[PDB]
Structure formats: C-alpha cells, structure tokens
Amino acid sequence: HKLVQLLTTT
Amino acid sequence: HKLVQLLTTT
Amino acid sequence: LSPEQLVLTLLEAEPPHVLISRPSAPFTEASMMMSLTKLADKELVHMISWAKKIPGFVELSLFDQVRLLESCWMEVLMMGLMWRSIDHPGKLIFAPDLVLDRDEGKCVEGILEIFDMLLATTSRFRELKLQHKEYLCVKAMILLNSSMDSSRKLAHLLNAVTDALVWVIAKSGISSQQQSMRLANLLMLLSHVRHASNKGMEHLLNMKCKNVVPVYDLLLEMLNAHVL
Amino acid sequence: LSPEQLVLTLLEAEPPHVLISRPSAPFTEASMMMSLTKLADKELVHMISWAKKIPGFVELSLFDQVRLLESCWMEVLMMGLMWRSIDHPGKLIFAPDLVLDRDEGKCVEGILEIFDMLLATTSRFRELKLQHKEYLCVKAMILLNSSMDSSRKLAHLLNAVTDALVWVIAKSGISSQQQSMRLANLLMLLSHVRHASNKGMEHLLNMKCKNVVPVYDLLLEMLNA
Ligand SMILES: O/N=C/c1ccc(-c2ccc(O)cc2)c2ccccc12
Ligand SMILES: O/N=C/c1ccc(-c2ccc(O)cc2)c2ccccc12
Secondary structure, three states: HHHHHHOOOO | OOHHHHHOOO | OHHHHHHHHHHOOOOOOOOOOOOOOOHHHHHHHHHHHHHHHHOOOOOHHHHHOOOOHHHHHHHHHHHHHHHHHHHHHHHHHHHHHHOOOOOOEEEEEEEEEEEEEEEOHHHHHHHHHHHHOOOOOOOOOHHHHHHHHHHHHHHHHHOOOOHHHHHHHHHHHHHHHHHHHHHOOOOOOHHHHHHHHEEEHHHHHHHHHHHHHHHHHHHHOOOOOOOOHHHHHHHHHHOO | OOOHHHHHHHHHHHHOOOOOOOOOOOOEEEEEHHHHHHHHHHHHHHHHHHHHHHOOHHHOOOHHHHHHHHHHHHHHHHHHHHHHHHOOOOOOEEEOOOEEEEHHHHOOHHHHHHHHHHHHHHHHHHHOOOOHHHHHHHHHHHHHHHOOOOHHHHHHHHHHHHHHHHHHHHHHOOOHHHHHHHHHHOOOOOHHHHHHHHHHHHHHHHHOOOOOOOOOHHHHHHHHO
C-alpha cells in the first residue's frame, strides 16, 4: 500500500 | 408533480 | 425583521411530531425498513409545509423551491432525527413508536454503517450542547444553502438565516472568541450530516431498485428527482 | 503554537505546483481523462507531504491519518484547483500549461456538469474575495474535519486551525459582526466543494469501471479507500 508508504516511509 | 402540488396548495 | 423574530418564525414553521402508528414490537429486517420509509414519506409532506413557512421561501421561483427541496430533503430529515435523539444517547429517535439502536441496525446490510454515522454526529451535537434555536437556524440553512431575480432573493434569505444563527450564539453570553469557535464547530458538523444523508440516499435507492420497500409516492418522486 | 505561527506553518507547507502539459492534438475523452488523472496522482503525492506538515497531524494514529486522507482527498484537490482559478474567471487552472475552459469539458461525457459546479463555486469565492491565508486554513480544515484519545487530539487540532482562521479574519479589520458573518459565509461553501468532489469521485470511479482510462498506483488506492 502506497499511501502508508508515503505517510510513514517517506 | 407531487412536490409541486404540495408547494402550490395549503 | 430582527434575528430574534426571524427565529420565532422558524419556531412557528416547525413540523408537528410524527408517529407511524405502530404497535410496539421487536423489529425485523422487513418491519424496520418499511417503518423508516413510511416515516420519511410522512415527514416529507410536513417538510414541504415547513419550508413554505420560512419567510420569503414562497417568493422564490417555483423552480428554485423545487430544486432546493429535491436536493436537501434527506439532510433535513437526518438533522431533525439528530435533534430528536440528542437527549437519548445510544438511540436514534425516529419517532415515539420508532426508537432504534445499533444491534437493530445489524439486521439489514449497510444500515449499521449509517446508524453509526448518525449516532456519532448526534453525539457531537450533544457534546456541544446544541440549543433548540441553533437547530432551527442550522436546519433552515441546510435547505437554503443546498443550492448546487430569484437567485438574488435566495442569497438575501440565506444571509438572513445566517445572521439569525450568529444572533442565537451571541445570546448565549460566551466570549467572542468562543462564539466564533462555536459558530465554526456547528457549521462544520453539517458536512457530517451531509455525509450521512448521502449514504442514506444510496441505500434507499438500492432498496427501491430491489423493491424491498414500498416506496411511497412522494418519497419515490423526491428520491428519483434527487438522484437524477 | 499561536494562530499566526500556525498560519505561517501552513503557508510554508503549501505544495509546489505540479506541471503537466496539455496534449498536442485537441482533447479526446481519453487524453483529457489521462491528463486529469495523471495530474491528480502527482498532486496526491504532494498532498501527503503537505498533510504531515499540518501541526499535530503526525501525532494522530496512523489509521486516523489514512482515514482522514482517504475521505477528503478529492475535496482537498478541488479546493486547490478553485484557488488556482480564483484570478482567471471562466477558466479552470489545473496547471500552468493546462488551462481548461468550461466548454472543453464537452469531450468527456459527464464532466461539463463538474466543471460548471467548480466554476460556480470558484465564482463565489471570488465574490467573497477569499484571501490566501483564509484559503490555507480552510483547506486544512477540510482535512481535519473529515472525521468521516486520538479523537480528542483530532478535535483539538481542528480547533487550532479554526482558531487561526478566526485570527486571519480579525486581521482584515471588519467589525466583529461582519467577522462572524464572513466566517459563516466561508464555511458554508464547504458543502459546495464537497458536492463537486462527490460528483468528481462518482464520475472517476465510473470512468474506471469502463476502463475509459487507467486508474492505479496512488490514485487507484485512494479511490477504493
Ligand atoms: O434504505 N434505507 C432507507 C432510509 C430511509 C429513510 C431514513 C430516515 C427516516 C426518517 C428520518 O427522519 C430520517 C431518515 C433512513 C435512516 C437511516 C438509514 C436508512 C434510511
Ligand atoms: O473522472 N473524473 C475524473 C477527475 C479526476 C481528477 C480531477 C482533478 C484533478 C486535479 C485537481 O487539482 C483537482 C481535481 C477532476 C476534476 C473535474 C472533473 C473530473 C476530475
């Protein structure tokens, strides 16, 4: 899931 | 016309 | 006309208390849904009479009157439901003979989601201690702001109801900062009422299409017109 | 954090404008849908970064952050769109090189209705003379009010931004009565923004099912919620 990546991994 | 009947009668 | 007397007219426009004339009985999928639609149809008739009592509404072009009511009806119904349920936490007071809760919403697929939304927004109004006069103004604003010679008149009327809500709040005697804060919190909750009504209409349309519920003449027209 | 510091923080957080080029040939239903969706997808990435800059947002539970964004993304996107179009009446400024006219919506069945709504609402903001700093607060309020004790914290975050909007309005100098009326007039437009976003959302979901255009990656995920 992209949204979770950008919220926490980016 | 049901809405219109009620908007034009009392 | 002062804000105070405009609010008096909204008080006077208030629709009567409606009952569905149902003998107390455990609700099932069929009775609950037939009860909700039967009630909405009756409330719609009174909603029309209510709107005509709002000073200046009947002076709008017929087309605008029809357009405003076809777009906001479910929101106005839900706002009324929330006011009625405010002093009854955990419950949705549709009517004296139609009091429903959460585990009863479970009985019909897709209803629980709507009951939860209704219950949560009601809880929010309860925490803010929504006052009767505030409810009167907000309900009228939902009707007049649902717009999506006569247009000009509509704007004058919406501004008048807005001026009245501001007056109601100023009257509570709280600080100016607190008044602006309250004004913003109440108006923002409208998005939540709108959200619940949108899901409410989506569910009803599916029930119409499935002929699961009898769709009362006026309810059907209002539903089809709104959807269209 | 004082109201002014919150406003300044939002100002800095404003996403940079996404550049997208207008197709070479005249628009077709596909080239227009590909243009709007490609833009949205790119704007969505900057939106997530913008959200993380809103004071207190990253302190909310991850599941609340995801829930808020999934619920308001199109509304936030359209609010931005309308602000960018504020000073170019009759036009929608999707991006520097993608200025679409009300009429160019004809090529996509169902779009014109959305363009009309957006333009009308934009006109209304133009009529109220919406200012940049009021715009910053309103857009953040859209995100925080999409509540569609992390919830205590959410209420507290929204009150903070609401507080800053009141501060900005008070800074215009108008009378207290007029300040209250302007606040109301500004928030009452949130229903209209939300209406257009619901229609754009329904339109987009349907354009997906018909494969009239590819909807994946960030955009798709956000679409399903
Ligand atoms: O398919 N379900 C349709 C449906 C139809 C009407 C209402 C309603 C009745 C009275 C009232 O005052 C407000 C809302 C509903 C309320 C909640 C879920 C579904 C509803
Ligand atoms: O199928 N309809 C799809 C669709 C997808 C995205 C947007 C949009 C793009 C950029 C922006 O900043 C705001 C909104 C749309 C705007 C207006 C109509 C339809 C749209």
